[PDB]
Symmetry: C4
Subunit: 394 residues, 4 copies
């Protein structure tokens, strides 16, 4: 018997019996066997096996058996087709690459997004801005002191607050130190309170954000407690430890983890490393080629080993041409170094065009990834919540 | 009985009785009840309940009951599916986020776009260019005087019309004052005519565009009536009130409200504030980081507290590096300040690349919003009009 | 009777009789009338009216009657739906704006793209490169002489070919005149041959490309025949007529009309004038606003009418700020004028960001139009030809 | 008889007999013939011819016969429709151009991507990094020596390694020669081993990458063996042969052929030559026009043949204006030459805007091509492998 009619939700699909056996182990293959009447309930009169699934995609599911290739329809959402083919016992790895990228589009993004009686209350005072009426004030104070520290760090590098008076040297003002002292007092209090009243201290140390808070207060204490005699080494060590203050601006990442857009940016960066590598490689190759070409172009009609050749051109060598190539490919154009010869002008035009092309090739991939993640997150926060409202298991 | 066949427009959908009860309160749930024969007319012979709706989307509507997840088909317009699921008594908030953004795509844009016997005629003389044979001429005259005022305001800042003669000072020409006098006469006449013959004076004051028209004529009268003795304070107050003349260029917005593209731009700006905030935050973080990094890079191999370190570099400090970072991230490249050291060159390349990336991330969202709004508005004005031509209520 | 079943290609659509009358005058409305049995052939047994059209779109065509709104399906090409609704006697102007832009997508582009026994042979010698074995050589010669003329015109402006000897003056070389003489001889021969052996001389004059060929040879003859005495006016008229030689570079458009990409560019420009107007308006408003703001920003903390205020800033006035604003909004950055004050720096950052935003808003529309036209043209030339191969009228 | 019902997978399509004959030679045309009962098996009772294909696309396949135009549905993958219409014996060249570009979208990209007992082992030691435990080390050594050679070549052009001592001249250091000697020894060993133990020596010579490896070592041997007497010609030939060392940086392409992104880039370049030609033509026309216009604009109100006119402007001539136009159209803005007159400023603004427009027109085509190729390749490498798992021929 070849007439095996299948009633999927009302539509009476029909095909030959031999076709269903092309994929042994699947539900249709089991159905096609003669000893399947009891396994699947069917009406003997109509002689049709009934199912309660989506009839639209069953056509493609069966066409897999017919032609031997699996495709996902473009008129339905990917997850729906995934659920249907999971019900029908078909692996999703067999989908052809013509329609795999869009099929595996929402799930990958979803997964990427998904990536002592006072201890609880004390730990909940910090680490969560919106969890009580007091955590918000603590977060605001932390933000205020972080911004004050960043501002003071930026001011310390100015010439108005570093007057020259150890013959003359340059001595920084004092109030810039008192402000940082107050900020450091607050930060050390917060750090002690967090570290003492926290579980799994090892995870706390590994958080990679407490290290920043520790190293941002260490230099102040080292400076205050290491300002004694023995200037020969003390002055040098203090001068080279004053560079560690750059870690004060990294505490701002301890505060932006709550902002949604920056989480989306982090996910996008973590999901598009290959594109960054490709961009770097393209830029390196182009920079090398165009530096060499401009170096040779700016010397046509010149004595090879003549000092005069490298006198009327900014490209004294190839290594310095990397800077010019990088500036030209990005359409930046500082103007510190430009060609002064017609062949150099042609090379510069080629460099600018090729730079635009190379830069514009991978960037759209990262942009599309970011757009996907951002739309998904904003839609996810648009919907407040929803109960199952389905009472499954009929 | 489990055989509950549904005839939706001709297609005979079939499913188990238990499935329809998974969503109590919905039309299908009421139908599945035994006491529903009289509620919904059906042929006892065929034993099928008839409906007169779209059969294509009923498959998805029922698959919601089957699998427990709601999706909108991608082969039909969103509004059609919305109407169908409103007929079937299903809330649109249950649609999964995999297909919610496109489903809520046209309606949000449509809503955003949708955002004394002489009093009527006198008020209609103004406030509406295309409403009579005389309003057009009034609008043209207003445009002419507005452009004249803007041109005179721009000229007043030039050195040819501000010769030096109160020892020398700089005295502006007189014709530039006579022109503005004529323009102010016209503007005050128009303002009086509008304010006198208008309803709900409070709304008139709150319009936020009449305030501009008032403040753009106030300084002229203050100047003409405040040019007496007591120079010690009169000269200073006049000099600092001469800055208020910048409000003369804002009257051009009173005239561009009719242009469609600028209304679309206003809607796009009002609908994409989060993207602007995200762009600002990204730029701020990048600027801070790259300013710090360039400041430190331009000093490798230097004495920490040595005046010579900040002698052969444009980056005397971090605050001035914000300007360089902003210029470099935008591919602008004025050239007023550029790195002069290899590490500085690497930092500059990184800054340019990261700036391109960050700028290109959110901007496409705003661009897509603007494109949607513009296409919708231009299509809306392409169609002149159309009667219902449906005679509903069959 | 309400059971009016419609058999469209096999699918048995069913609906109430009253529904079909909602749109009087249409084919379905006529069918629903009791006196329609003879008009449309149907089987009395099945009691179903047969049609031989596409069943898929009939669902939407009937849903128009059901719900009262017309939509075009997104799983089929627009022209197919247009043909179907033309067969069903429904106007295409009733489609809702949610799906009108894509429906009217291919046809508009197609229409835009669609926009004496020796007289025939002589006229066919020119005006068509690929029409014989001799027209190609004539076109190549014309191209050669056009390029020679352009090169000579560009050289005439150089300082090497204009030595100073009417005391000194500057006298151009002679060979640059002999070359142009040869080119002009060829061009006048071609122009005479074209004008003499052509129909509808008025259309020839109106072609707008023969005027260029005439004005590009007129100055040479005027110069050669107007080099006599009376220098007082002859020298001046010759000097101001030497400017007309710029029309020699416009003959290149007489030759690029065959290239497909430039025809596509012309169509895109002719189809996107509103976007250019919008871009111009946006740029003008931004330039004005930012020029005013930078002018005022560069003077904070200054004496209003003090010559010293306009001494340490490039923005002596607002009009010169238009140039800076235009350069900054485009990310060009010549560097001839930049802010030197922190408020000026903030204004410049805002200007650059707003310029990027404004420029990026309408340009994508033009880009999409160009892509559509280019893809359509390249696909049209990919297909060589095809006979009807349908033998219609069955 | 006109009732010819077709049972395609369960759906009972019906149409007139005359319709099927509109396309003679096709399977449906043969079926419609009276002598086709035995050719195609069918049930005499149901009077319906059975098929085992996809019912969804059969509607469009038959609509081709109905209306006379062929379209591909947008709810299925192109290859599926291609297979179906190949089964139904319909040529794919008849598809209208409204839906041809997307139909021929995956296949073109797929095709483009698809574009002495020791001889085998010895040849497999090279030419394949991942084929053994020793080839990887050889590839790493080759990479190390290639990078060393490139670094030495770049250093040779510096002034620190070319001190001045044939009166003074400039003599390069010696260690830079010893390093290159070691690298050349390795490279010549590798080249000999490859050329000796390879088949079809002609293909080896034609590989176009062995020529680079040969010419990159030839100059070293020529220099070492051509440093004798007869300086008059020896010095000149050595100086002009020292330029051939630029071929040392091209060996890096012998190593990047394995990287996937660069193969994708090569395919994209090979598939988008017309777009590059179009970009070049657009840039040339714009450059010419804007150079002429700026040359004329910077001279309004000047004596035609006066030396003073070309004294206060950077545009001494039109040829030098090509450089300015190229720099301005790309938003690069070096600043070496800028307009200094209001008409020049207007021309510059127009040039910048038109340059942005022209550059942005074709580039998106190349970007889309690259995105398609990259996504296809990355998806192809995501899937490790898969057996047929279909056992065809039922
Ligand atoms: C992927 C790659 C992409 C590449 C894209 C780009 C590809 C670019 C491709 C090619 C560009 C080629 C440009 C070559 C320019 C040479 C000019 C020169 O050196 O002149 C000097 C050579 O002479 C001297 O320096 C001193 C005299 C020695 C004898 C010279 C004899 C002639 C040699 C000829 C050797 C030619 C062959 C050289 C080797 C090829 C000076 O010559 P002169 O006669 O002494 O003085 C003339 C003065 N006059 C002009 C005022 C009358
Ligand atoms: C997110 C973050 C991303 C970051 C990305 C980027 C990451 C970048 C990471 C790292 C970059 C590290 C660069 C370090 C360069 C130091 C150079 C220097 O100071 O030399 C001076 C130090 O000496 C003096 O100034 C005076 C003498 C004092 C004693 C010095 C002993 C050596 C100290 C060594 C301390 C090393 C450790 C310093 C602390 C690390 C001069 O030395 P000299 O011997 O007096 O003179 C040499 C002269 N000669 C060269 C001509 C022979
Ligand atoms: C869409 C729109 C977007 C807009 C976005 C941007 C929005 C931006 C919004 C606001 C920005 C506001 C900036 C104001 C800066 C004023 C500075 C100034 O003029 O100082 C001079 C005024 O004095 C003189 O010039 C001479 C003395 C006359 C008496 C002055 C008394 C104080 C007046 C105050 C009037 C204030 C109010 C002015 C009117 C507002 C000098 O003062 P001095 O005391 O003589 O000398 C001080 C010297 N010292 C500093 C070294 C000690
Ligand atoms: C696709 C294309 C896109 C194009 C877009 C752009 C399109 C742009 C379109 C048009 C722009 C047109 C600009 C014209 C400017 C001319 C200025 C000039 O030359 O003045 C000089 C002419 O005179 C001399 O040089 C010496 C005296 C000779 C007699 C002059 C008589 C007047 C001639 C008039 C001939 C006019 C017609 C010229 C031919 C058209 C000096 O004149 P003057 O009187 O000696 O001195 C005045 C001094 N004063 C001002 C201080 C009082
Ligand atoms: C270093 C030097 N010093 C004195 C020189 N004198 C002189 O004439 N040249 C020279 C310069 N470039 C040349 O070719 C060019 C031109 C443009 C780009 C380009 C090339 C390459 C080599 C193919 C690589 O990319 C040639 Cl062939 C020569 C002979 C000189 N080079
Ligand atoms: C202010 C100053 N004054 C004199 C100095 N002398 C000297 O050598 N440095 C110096 C400079 N940059 C350093 O590191 C770099 C390099 C590039 C970027 C970058 C860094 C950080 C600090 C990790 C942050 O981002 C180091 Cl480690 C040092 C020792 C000096 N800094
Ligand atoms: C012409 C002049 N000459 C001497 C001055 N001295 C001085 O202090 N100002 C000044 C400058 N800009 C001011 O405001 C700013 C700042 C930035 C941008 C901006 C504004 C506006 C006016 C709101 C418009 O856009 C103010 Cl309020 C003042 C008082 C002076 N202006
Ligand atoms: C070479 C020269 N030398 C002395 C001159 N003195 C003078 O006045 N001109 C001049 C300059 N440009 C003119 O027109 C312009 C303006 C801007 C752009 C543009 C044009 C064209 C010609 C239509 C082409 O594109 C005119 Cl009409 C004239 C009379 C002079 N030109
Ligand atoms: K740029
Ligand atoms: K730039
Ligand atoms: K620039
Ligand atoms: K610059
Ligand atoms: Zn979905
Ligand atoms: Zn719609
Ligand atoms: Zn189509
Ligand atoms: Zn497919």
């Amino acid at each position: 018997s070849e007439r095996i009619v299948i009633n999927v939700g009302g539509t009476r699909h029909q095909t030959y019996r031999s076709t269903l056996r092309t994929l042994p182990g699947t539900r249709l293959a089991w159905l096609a066997e003669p000893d399947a009447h009891s396994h699947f309930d069917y009406d003997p009169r109509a002689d049709e096996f009934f199912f309660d699934r989506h009839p639209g995609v069953f056509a493609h599911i069966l066409n897999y058996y017919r032609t031997g290739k699996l495709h996902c329809p473009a008129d339905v959402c990917g997850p729906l087709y995934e659920e249907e083919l999971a019900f029908w016992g078909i692996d999703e790895t067999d989908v052809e690459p013509c329609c795999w990228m869009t099929y595996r589009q929402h799930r990958d993004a979803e997964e990427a997004l998904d990536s002592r009686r006072w201890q609880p209350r004390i730990w909940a005072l910090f680490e969560d801005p919106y969890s009580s009426r007091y955590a918000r004030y603590v977060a605001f104070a932390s933000l205020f002191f972080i911004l004050v520290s960043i501002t003071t760090f930026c001011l310390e590098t100015h010439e108005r607050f570093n007057p020259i008076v150890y013959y003359r040297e340059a001595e920084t003002e004092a109030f810039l130190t008192y402000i940082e002292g107050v900020c450091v007092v607050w930060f050390t209090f917060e750090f002690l309170m967090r570290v003492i009243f926290c579980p799994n201290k090892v995870e706390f140390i590994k958080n990679s954000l407490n290290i920043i808070d520790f190293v941002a207060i260490l230099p102040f204490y080292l400076e205050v407690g290491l300002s004694g005699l023995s200037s020969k080494a003390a002055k040098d060590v203090l001068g080279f430890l004053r560079v560690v203050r750059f870690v004060r601006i990294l505490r701002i990442f301890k505060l932006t983890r709550h902002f949604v857009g920056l989480r989306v940016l982090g996910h996008t960066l973590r999901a598009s490393t290959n594109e960054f590598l490709l961009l770097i490689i393209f830029l390196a190759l182009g920079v090398l080629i165009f530096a060499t070409m401009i170096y040779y172009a700016e010397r046509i009609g010149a004595q090879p080993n003549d000092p005069s050749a490298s006198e009327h051109t900014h490209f004294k060598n190839i290594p310095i041409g990397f800077w010019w190539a990088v500036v030209t490919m990005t359409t930046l154009g500082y103007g510190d170094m430009y060609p002064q010869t017609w062949s150099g002008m042609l090379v510069g035009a080629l460099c600018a065009l090729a730079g635009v092309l190379t830069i514009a090739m991978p960037v759209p991939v990262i942009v599309n990834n970011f757009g996907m993640y951002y739309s998904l997150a904003m839609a996810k926060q648009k919907l407040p919540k929803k109960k199952k409202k389905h009472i499954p298991r009929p």
